[PDB]
Amino acid sequence: SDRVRSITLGNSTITTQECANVVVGYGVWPEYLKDNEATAEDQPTQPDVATCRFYTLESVQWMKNSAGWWWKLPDALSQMGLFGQNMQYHYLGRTGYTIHVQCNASKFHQGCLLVVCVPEAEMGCSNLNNTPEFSELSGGDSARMFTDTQVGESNAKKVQTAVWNAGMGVGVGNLTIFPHQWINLRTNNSATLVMPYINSVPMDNMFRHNNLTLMIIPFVPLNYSEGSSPYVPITVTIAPMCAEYNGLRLAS
Amino acid sequence: AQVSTQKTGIHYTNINYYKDAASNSANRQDFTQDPGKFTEPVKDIMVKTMPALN
Amino acid sequence: AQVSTQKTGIHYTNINYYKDAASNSANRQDFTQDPGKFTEPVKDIMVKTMPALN
Amino acid sequence: AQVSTQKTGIHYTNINYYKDAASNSANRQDFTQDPGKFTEPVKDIMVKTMPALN
Amino acid sequence: GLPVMTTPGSTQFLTSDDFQSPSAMPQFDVTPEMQIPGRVNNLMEIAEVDSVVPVNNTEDNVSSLKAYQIPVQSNSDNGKQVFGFPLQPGANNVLNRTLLGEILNYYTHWSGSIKLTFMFCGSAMATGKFLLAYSPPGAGVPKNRKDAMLGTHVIWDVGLQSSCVLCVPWISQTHYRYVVEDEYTAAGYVTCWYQTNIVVPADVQSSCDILCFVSACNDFSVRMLKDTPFIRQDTFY
Amino acid sequence: GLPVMTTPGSTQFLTSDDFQSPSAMPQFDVTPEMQIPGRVNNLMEIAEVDSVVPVNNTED
Amino acid sequence: GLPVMTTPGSTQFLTSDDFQSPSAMPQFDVTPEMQIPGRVNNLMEIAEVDSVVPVNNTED
Amino acid sequence: ARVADTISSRPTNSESIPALTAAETGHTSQVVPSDTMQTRHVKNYHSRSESSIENFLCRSACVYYATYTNNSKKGFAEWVINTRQVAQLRRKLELFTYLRFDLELTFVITSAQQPSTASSVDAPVQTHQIMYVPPGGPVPTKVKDYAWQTSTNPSVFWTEGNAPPRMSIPFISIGNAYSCFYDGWTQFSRNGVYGINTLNNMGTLYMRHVNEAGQGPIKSTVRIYFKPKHVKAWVPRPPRLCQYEKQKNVNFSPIGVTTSRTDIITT
Amino acid sequence: ARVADTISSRPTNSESIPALTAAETGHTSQVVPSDTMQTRHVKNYHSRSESSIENFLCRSACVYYATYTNNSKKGFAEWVINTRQVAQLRRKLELFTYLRFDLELTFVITSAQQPSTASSVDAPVQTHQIMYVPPGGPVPTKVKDYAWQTSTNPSVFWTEGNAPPRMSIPFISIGNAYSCFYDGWTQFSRNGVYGINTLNNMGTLYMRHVNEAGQGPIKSTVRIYFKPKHVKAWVPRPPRLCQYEKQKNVNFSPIGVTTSRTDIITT
Amino acid sequence: ARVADTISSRPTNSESIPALTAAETGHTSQVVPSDTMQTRHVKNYHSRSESSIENFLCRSACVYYATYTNNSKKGFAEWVINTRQVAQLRRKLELFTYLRFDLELTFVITSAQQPSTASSVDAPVQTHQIMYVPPGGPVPTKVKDYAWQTSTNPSVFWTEGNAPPRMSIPFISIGNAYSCFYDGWTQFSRNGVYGINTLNNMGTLYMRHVNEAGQGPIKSTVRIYFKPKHVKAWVPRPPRLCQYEKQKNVNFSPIGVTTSRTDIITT
Ligand SMILES: CCCCCCCCCCCCCCCC(=O)O
Ligand SMILES: CCCCCCCCCCCCCCCC(=O)O
Numbered sequence A: 001s002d003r004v005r006s007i008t009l010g011n012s013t014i015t016t017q018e019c020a021n022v023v024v025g026y027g028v029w030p031e032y033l034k035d036n037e038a039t040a041e042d043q044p045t046q047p048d049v050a051t052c053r054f055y056t057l058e059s060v061q062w063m064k065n066s067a068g069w070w071w072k073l074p075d076a077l078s079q080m081g082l083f084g085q086n087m088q089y090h091y092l093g094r095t096g097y098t099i100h101v102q103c104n105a106s107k108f109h110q111g112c113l114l115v116v117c118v119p120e121a122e123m124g125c126s127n128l129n130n131t132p133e134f135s136e137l138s139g140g141d142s143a144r145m146f147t148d149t150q151v152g153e154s155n156a157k158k159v160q161t162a163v164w165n166a167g168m169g170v171g172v173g174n175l176t177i178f179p180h181q182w183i184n185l186r187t188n189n190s191a192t193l194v195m196p197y198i199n200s201v202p203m204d205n206m207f208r209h210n211n212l213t214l215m216i217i218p219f220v221p222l223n224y225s226e227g228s229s230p231y232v233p234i235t236v237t238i239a240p241m242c243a244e245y246n247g248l249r250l251a252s
Numbered sequence B, C, D: 001a002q003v004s005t006q007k008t009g010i011h012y013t014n015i016n017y018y019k020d021a022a023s024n025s026a027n028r029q030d031f032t033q034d035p036g037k038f039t040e041p042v043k044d045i046m047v048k049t050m051p052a053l054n
Numbered sequence E: 001g002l003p004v005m006t007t008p009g010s011t012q013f014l015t016s017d018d019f020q021s022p023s024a025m026p027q028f029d030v031t032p033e034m035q036i037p038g039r040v041n042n043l044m045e046i047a048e049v050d051s052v053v054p055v056n057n058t059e060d061n062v063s064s065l066k067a068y069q070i071p072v073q074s075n076s077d078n079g080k081q082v083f084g085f086p087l088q089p090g091a092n093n094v095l096n097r098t099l100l101g102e103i104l105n106y107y108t109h110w111s112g113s114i115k116l117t118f119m120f121c122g123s124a125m126a127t128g129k130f131l132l133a134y135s136p137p138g139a140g141v142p143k144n145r146k147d148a149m150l151g152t153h154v155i156w157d158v159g160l161q162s163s164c165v166l167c168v169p170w171i172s173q174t175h176y177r178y179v180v181e182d183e184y185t186a187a188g189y190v191t192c193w194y195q196t197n198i199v200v201p202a203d204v205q206s207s208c209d210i211l212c213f214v215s216a217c218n219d220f221s222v223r224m225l226k227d228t229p230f231i232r233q234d235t236f237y
Numbered sequence F, G: 001g002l003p004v005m006t007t008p009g010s011t012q013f014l015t016s017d018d019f020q021s022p023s024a025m026p027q028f029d030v031t032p033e034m035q036i037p038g039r040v041n042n043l044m045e046i047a048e049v050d051s052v053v054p055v056n057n058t059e060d
Numbered sequence H, I, J: 001a002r003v004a005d006t007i008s009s010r011p012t013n014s015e016s017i018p019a020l021t022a023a024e025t026g027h028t029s030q031v032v033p034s035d036t037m038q039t040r041h042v043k044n045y046h047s048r049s050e051s052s053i054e055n056f057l058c059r060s061a062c063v064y065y066a067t068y069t070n071n072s073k074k075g076f077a078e079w080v081i082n083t084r085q086v087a088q089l090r091r092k093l094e095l096f097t098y099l100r101f102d103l104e105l106t107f108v109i110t111s112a113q114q115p116s117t118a119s120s121v122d123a124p125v126q127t128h129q130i131m132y133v134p135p136g137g138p139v140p141t142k143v144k145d146y147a148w149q150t151s152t153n154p155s156v157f158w159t160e161g162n163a164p165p166r167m168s169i170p171f172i173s174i175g176n177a178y179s180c181f182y183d184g185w186t187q188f189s190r191n192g193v194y195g196i197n198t199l200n201n202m203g204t205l206y207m208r209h210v211n212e213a214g215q216g217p218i219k220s221t222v223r224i225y226f227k228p229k230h231v232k233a234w235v236p237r238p239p240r241l242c243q244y245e246k247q248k249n250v251n252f253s254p255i256g257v258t259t260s261r262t263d264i265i266t267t
């Protein structure tokens, strides 16, 4: 039976009784930096049980007229435990991730979700001259949501959040070129993606650069009949993997 | 002088004249494929004839 | 470098410079004849000295 | 004909055509270092871990 | 003074030439290479990845997520058609904009098989059986399930495994086909019919949906690179 | 800089020349060859075939 | 008359080229070399020498 | 490729009949002249090297010429590539039914001065661009257009006063050979286009001036030359008798088989 | 790079299910058409040689063109080097996230005569200078300036009527690859510039006439062509749907996913 | 020429003092950063190839430009050869005290049309002559002179519209190296000329038109470019702070050492 997993990281454990396979990045598992690729020449810090564990974000409600949600990935964990405290005292850092999206409903509900992970998901603005400001591009472990309409040009600094363009000007059906899974309420209950470190430099600052984006888009909308449960949540759980830091300084 | 194989559906000769490796010609004959890292990026391998979920 | 025979009534040298076989020179020296498929396309062979119909 | 090593991050060929050595190309590949004649021009050698004056 | 003689084709700029040129910055030290995940060596590795197909254009679903959903009901008769489109992977507006149909619009010739995957995104208590057919050209489009069963078909039974693959084989008189629309190199039609009904229990919604995917097999190839007609410009940005 | 010297007959287009030229479509895969019946190698195989002669022109 | 073909980049003056050129004074005897102290081979030997830093600019 | 030599012969009186045959079998007689008369031994040194398919077809032939003007709104030229607008190359290629070759392309570009009205007309050297668009791509609509960016379409640039431009083209086809004749339609309902126009899809060739119209109009003319290399040929064919009339089809007006003489015994 | 060939098959009645799968795993099915129907043995000779990254990207594409006038105060041209002002090369390079290549640079220079007023206008051959200034150096402010001494900046000289100038550029970068997309700011306070403009620092390119304005104005135009060599590519990306609007950012107007048809069963 | 790599280190508590030294000895400390803090092992692949004396100095730099007119009595140009009239090559060569190299010489010649008064001005191609006179020989006094016979002086001829002329010069000197600085006089009585003008004796370079003034004046301009090859260098030197004022000597006006800021703690 392929339907059961068990993931153990630190002092936390996930158990699943209804699951698909585990998608591993681009075939690569996360690992520490080697001596041939290093450029910063002082010794890095590896706490490795205090940071590499499962942190759970907030929950969102899947409604019937629901369009989608997104998260910027080294930003939702910026106030979570000892992971968000090492980011404030250090200048560099590199991390791999393990994402577990989970949503349960009965055999009398239907719907489908696409869970992708997009590296360098640069987004656009509703006014054609400006760029979006920081408060709309991300939130502290709170979802920013798409909408089925088009944001007008009368606003100045807001993200263009039409779902069929995916915020980036591309087709939403072609997002399956990135590592992804589906959640089908007929057969599935969760989705698990393992992502390595992807950048053009061996280390980077985690406060000026978001290098991953997790999107959850309902392709088939949620439907049920009269009498069934109307409230269906979605919960996301992220665990850092093989994290290390460089450049101690003041607290920023 | 390098002697290569001259793509058909016969050989040719190639000599480098400059001191920098950025001055050479294009590669044009490096045929390598690895489609499995995009099409099957899963943890446990999946046999085609077996069902996906047991 | 190919050394060929240089049609008379003496040799020459030829080197290929490009990577594609459509960039070469013309053949010009492939002399081959098979006139029998047009002039005698019959089933049973016919000897010249014998009559055609017996 | 000289065959050299063609700096990268593969070989090349070089022939001289003229009779004078001032007609050649630039050197461009003579990497030699001696920083000690400017940075430590002292008489008695100084070990790093020992103090300078005893 | 070696005697030489210059041929036609001198002092010309052919934009696809293969020559050596002198470097403008001699003896430069480039940054050493790093192992970044996800290296692309061939463009065919991109085209062999599934992509959702918008079969439901219908004049007002294109600015919506409803273009990707195929409606499925419970009927009072038998043998109705679900969808149907001609197999033109670079000229028909259904398969035009997908991940396979964008690589083909950079080339002129194509050859190989095509996979079509269908997923049933309905309730876990609903059943059904479908017919997924392919008809080579020469005749018209099949108007019945009796005419569509004579071609190449598969019967899909919806159960625990929620997907099925209809592998369109390479049936052609030539070795390659044109990407642009051409009646000499047509490829045929792909249809879908009801085999049995969608039987559903009480307190379950009858209307379900089906998603569609498309990709390429391992014998697919392309030829004769050209420009794409999918971009404009008027002035410099 | 190898010293060279250009002769008469440079930058001319003789219509029966025999030279190499750079390809405009690099790395092209042509269709494989097939065995079609009736291959002509020399034009003398065409001339060695009988043909009916109009000996009776006579103005009408 | 060897057949040749000239490429783009002909009759241009790139100021950082690396070519041979004919000498204007043939068979010249240069003065022999002498051992002068303090030969520089790399510019990094100059940069590895201490230099006093003006930290106290302050407008006057 | 030496020819056969002559064998000496003697007076005969026998049962063998080389001169008598039957042409009803569709079989050409294989008699040599040393069977019907007395011959001497002659060593032939003649060769059949100049009649090969590689020697008969590998010459440059003009296929088209077009003009375009500098001082003109939308002044540029286009041409859909075929080999059926000239009368001399069309008759040479239609001695066979199926052909397969590589190509060599050469362009000859001239210029001429138009009657302007300004004084002190002096123009610099002219530069031309020739672009090839495979079928399906975007086409230029004017001279200052975005379609001349030639990102993936092959093009060539040339300055006036040099050697003519030249390039090679491989065997670009969908079938296994080029077809000079097609006996059929393009529709399965047997309507519409009938003939060789159903197989012709090779692209379009565009031409323009890259300079600007300074102070006087200039009218240029390009000429295109074809040269087949690495030739194979199949199924020979009778040569064309009547004159060509159109480009798309083989329509003709009937004509006599030869010219006439005044008697059957007229020498 | 030959493709896989077809294997013959037989009628089956068994437990193995190749056609049934689960697309919820994020795993594309590996079925061949010899599993769903009866096939014959076919040897394929097709190759995937024309779709390589070395063959898809190694073609010359126009990136910019600028003009400058002879008889003008401060008549010269400048350009800050980027690959985001044209629409055809920007869509080809943005199919990937990280790229690493060498470069080949080609310039096409023309000229035109302006409406002067003198009689007997006759000018000699024109010479042009193209200078490259890396970031931080001194820039020219006029035509007769000291900054054109090109002591250590690389430049090129060219006389009109010859082959176009060409040179090579290695992989000049500070990181390990070029980045087509950057999701972040340049300040640590997360203000100001957001996007790919924080990584673009390549220099400026200057153009001028070396001759003097003799008796008539002359307006020239240069065109710049890019050609990537020795290409590596990572992390592919969906192609762009909407039209580009600006150069610094990725702002767009929303558009439908395809064009429409009249029914779901319309063929 | 790879750089040194980093060695891993451990926490210490010992008698050895790498950080403490004495700068009074005239000896630069040889400490690496793996002595003052805890480091990791890092393999460096960087090279010092671009900072060599062969790479720093072997680029072409403009040294002079002069003009001469066709329709003029005694219209020709002369130049006494030195490297002290430009500001960019003078600062690069004066980082050392003694230099020894070969030379490469390149000329860039243009032309311009002057406002003549005749109608139908049309001139043929221009030819120029550049002559080198070593010190002591006969010098030209006009354009039609006997001194242009160039029997033993090296000269060069060039027709307009081709590649620029180029030649090589060996290490021509009387001493063992060139001297950028000379602290002394030329007389034994210590009077008169003081400085580098006592060592400069390299010759004069002459330029003229070989054609005749047909019907309109023409003004030409030559530009001279230096490129040192096979370089050796001795005794480095601080770079120049003030601006150059003259050519023969090192006279200056005093200036501050840097630019100012508003406080000592201003970041
Ligand atoms: C600048 C590049 C130009 C490229 C020109 C390519 C032209 C394609 C040649 C097609 C050959 C046509 C052969 C005859 C076709 C037929 O008889 O059916
Ligand atoms: C005369 C010499 C000219 C030298 C020109 C050098 C131009 C540098 C090329 C930079 C490549 C830019 C690549 C794209 C940058 C990016 O995408 O971030």
Ligand SMILES: CCCCCCCCCCCCCCCC(=O)O
Binding pocket: G024, J081, J082, J083, J103, J105, J130, J131, J132, J154, J155, J156, J167, J169, J178, J179, J180, J199, J200, J202
């Ligand atoms: C046509 C032939 C021209 C020959 C030109 C020869 C020029 C001699 C070069 C002398 C080099 C001057 C070096 C600097 C002298 C110094 O610093 O004291």
